[PDB]
Amino acid sequence: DTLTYSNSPVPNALLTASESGFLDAAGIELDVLSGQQGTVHFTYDQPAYTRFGGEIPPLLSEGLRAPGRTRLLGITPLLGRQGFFVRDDSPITAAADLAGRRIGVSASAIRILRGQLGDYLELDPWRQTLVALGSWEARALLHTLEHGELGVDDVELVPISSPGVDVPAEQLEESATVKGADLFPDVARGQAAVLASGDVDALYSWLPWAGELQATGARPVVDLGLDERNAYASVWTVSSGLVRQRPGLVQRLVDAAVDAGLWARDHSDAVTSLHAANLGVSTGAVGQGFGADFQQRLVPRLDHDALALLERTQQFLLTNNLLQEPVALDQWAAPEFLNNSLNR
Ligand SMILES: O=S(O)c1ccccc1-c1ccccc1
Description:
- Monomer.
- Its EC number is 3.13.1.3.
- Keywords: Cytoplasm, Hydrolase, Monooxygenase, Oxidoreductase, Plasmid.
- By secondary structure, this protein is an alpha/beta fold.
- It has helices at residues 13-19, 22-25, 40-43, 56-65, 107-114, 125-132, 135-146, 169-174, 180-183, 187-196, 207-215, 240-245, 247-264, 268-279, 283-290, 304-319, 329-332, 335-342; strands at residues 2-7, 29-32, 49-53, 70-78, 82-87, 102-105, 156-159, 202-206, 218-220, 232-239.
- It folds into two domains: 1-78 and 232-344, Periplasmic binding protein-like II (D-Maltodextrin-Binding Protein, domain 2), CATH 3.40.190.10; 79-231, D-Maltodextrin-Binding Protein, domain 2, CATH 3.40.190.270.
- It is built from 18 helices and ten strands.
- The strands form two sheets. It has a five-stranded mixed beta sheet with strand order 2-1-3-10-4.
- α10 (187-196) packs across α11 (207-215) and α14 (268-279) packs across α15.
- It is globular, with a radius of gyration of 19 Å.
- 52% of the residues are buried.
- Bound molecules: 1,1'-biphenyl-2-sulfinic acid.
């Protein structure tokens, strides 16, 4: 069987099972989304599509635009090097030092931080979701400033380009695929340039990108990766029709991901390498961006703790008016598959 797919620049068992051959053994082959069909990464508008990535796009799709297109198969928390980075030679060493400083943030993050979404509700799915992706920077800045007893009104918000948030339709359509290596090439190099421009004092970085940025001679004012309140819940979705019509296929898919997740625990280097190749980053940055032992946490989850993390992100979206009505996670989830896999 053939399924179209994609994954965000996050640790996940779908990519792992695919690259390690577990899916092939299960008689499943995945075809990654081309840049020309890239919007599906945000819209889920395909009959046999599966994605494992950030939770914001699917939450918006299910809760704001097209309820019912997907079912949730599992969750894999994400937490690693994260925060507002400054050059090593910057006199800024504590959160309090950010007072009155120039914080580079995406236009999307500025809308959220200002509490002024503008035309948000009128935007097409792609641009609309990109506004919501400004949430990473927004929450990170709020948490960071709390450390110095500061608020958003105590700093200068300066518009800059942020990876994954600023993705023009032309860039997407011109990209070979939605793999990080194609869509997000040399992120750290670009962020290092912003910090060297003399017009910004700090900017937000995370994922392996933060690992490579750090290597250029930069550091986070506050490493948000050290506090779980900065974690996100990567979600694994599949077209709802497959769940209802081809449960056998979905079960084989989930079984393969679980086996791949178990296998990953004893093949850390291979898992690091396949993620590094997929994202187009150094192998060392993967561990920094996802956590040193992320390979031990690849078996998908649907336990209450995992669902609570997903709910936490959903609440940030609701509070900030990015979502008006919440997605019923228990209804969205299709726990029977993962449950059957773990009971083998
Ligand atoms: O949750 S998202 O998939 C996501 C999560 C983390 C980093 C990048 C992206 C992304 C943004 C735009 C297009 C493709 C990926």
